[PDB]
Amino acid sequence: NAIKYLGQDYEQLRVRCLQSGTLFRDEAFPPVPQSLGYKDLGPNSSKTYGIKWKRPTELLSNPQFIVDGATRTDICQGALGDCWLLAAIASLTLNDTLLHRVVPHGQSFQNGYAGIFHFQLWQFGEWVDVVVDDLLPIKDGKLVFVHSAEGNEFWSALLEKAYAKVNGSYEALSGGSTSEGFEDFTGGVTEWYELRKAPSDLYQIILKALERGSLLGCSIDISSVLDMEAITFKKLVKGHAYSVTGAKQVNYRGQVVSLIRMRNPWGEVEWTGAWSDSSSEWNNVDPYERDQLRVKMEDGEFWMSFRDFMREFTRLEICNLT
Numbered sequence: 001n002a003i004k005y006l007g008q009d010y011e012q013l014r015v016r017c018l019q020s021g022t023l024f025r026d027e028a029f030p031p032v033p034q035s036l037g038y039k040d041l042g043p044n045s046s047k048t049y050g051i052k053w054k055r056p057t058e059l060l061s062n063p064q065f066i067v068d069g070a071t072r073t074d075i076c077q078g079a080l081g082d083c084w085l086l087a088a089i090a091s092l093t094l095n096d097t098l099l100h101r102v103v104p105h106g107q108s109f110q111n112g113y114a115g116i117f118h119f120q121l122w123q124f125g126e127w128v129d130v131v132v133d134d135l136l137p138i139k140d141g142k143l144v145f146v147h148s149a150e151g152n153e154f155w156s157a158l159l160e161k162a163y164a165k166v167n168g169s170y171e172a173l174s175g176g177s178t179s180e181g182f183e184d185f186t187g188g189v190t191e192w193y194e195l196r197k198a199p200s201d202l203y204q205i206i207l208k209a210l211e212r213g214s215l216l217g218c219s220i221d222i223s224s225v226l227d228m229e230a231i232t233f234k235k236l237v238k239g240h241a242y243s244v245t246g247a248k249q250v251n252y253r254g255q256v257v258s259l260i261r262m263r264n265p266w267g268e269v270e271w272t273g274a275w276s277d278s279s280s281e282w283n284n285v286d287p288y289e290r291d292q293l294r295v296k297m298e299d300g301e302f303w304m305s306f307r308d309f310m311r312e313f314t315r316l317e318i319c320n321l322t
């Protein structure tokens, strides 16, 4: 049904490997310096020094494709500036049908393992099935790029690998917090908002985008590279893409307050202002609202008020489907 990237046929390649008692080695994306990168991850780079390509089945006795669902907690940025892509993947997990397109859930390391996995990527303006072998860059016994908070989980590492594959290298995934040089992730129309000059009904726009399963991301702009990925006083990261993962209205001190939830794809480092995990704003909402929305954990995810949100962040991007 879906076009096969480069004519590679997952099931056909899988059984060939099974029947010959072997593990898949992708010719289309070899475990080689050029697959890593071309400059910062380039030949002989100190960043790539000591990298080896190892299967999860070499690292562990119990590797898992999916552990407790394929969720946003499974997206932790490694040593690669692919924050926009990782933020989009985190947002994609919130969309159940789209997630089950992109990440075929049947796959595992247990039954019929041949060192091969596949994903359905939006490429050339259609759904494209992409195979990968499960060799992944490792440094000091750990994944170099995206990892899950669950150490034996590999769907996201493998998904990032498929993206690296269709772009020719991992470094090719790097860049800015915007869709700079990144083709359609979604195919539908992309909406862009400068937050200081937003439509008066922006909160409702965000809310309805989330409800219909669009992907939302936001970032703070920069001019020079000396303040690139610079950390704010209240611990926001500049020039870095965040997933917008939720929006809720609360009754705060008797008044309707609009709140917005976002996730740093680092899976750590969070806003410390009003509505943060440990902030006192939660003492002034209905205790049951509090219990329902607040989660006290260093997980990259946090709430802000929508007003503080539009003050702090420069832009919101919405990626719609077809």
Ligand SMILES: [Ca+2]
Residues within 6 Å of the ligand: 066, 067, 068, 069, 070, 071, 074, 148, 150, 153
């Ligand atoms: Ca998981």
Ligand SMILES: [Ca+2]
Residues within 6 Å of the ligand: 270, 277, 295, 296, 297, 298, 299, 300, 301, 302
């Ligand atoms: Ca948190």
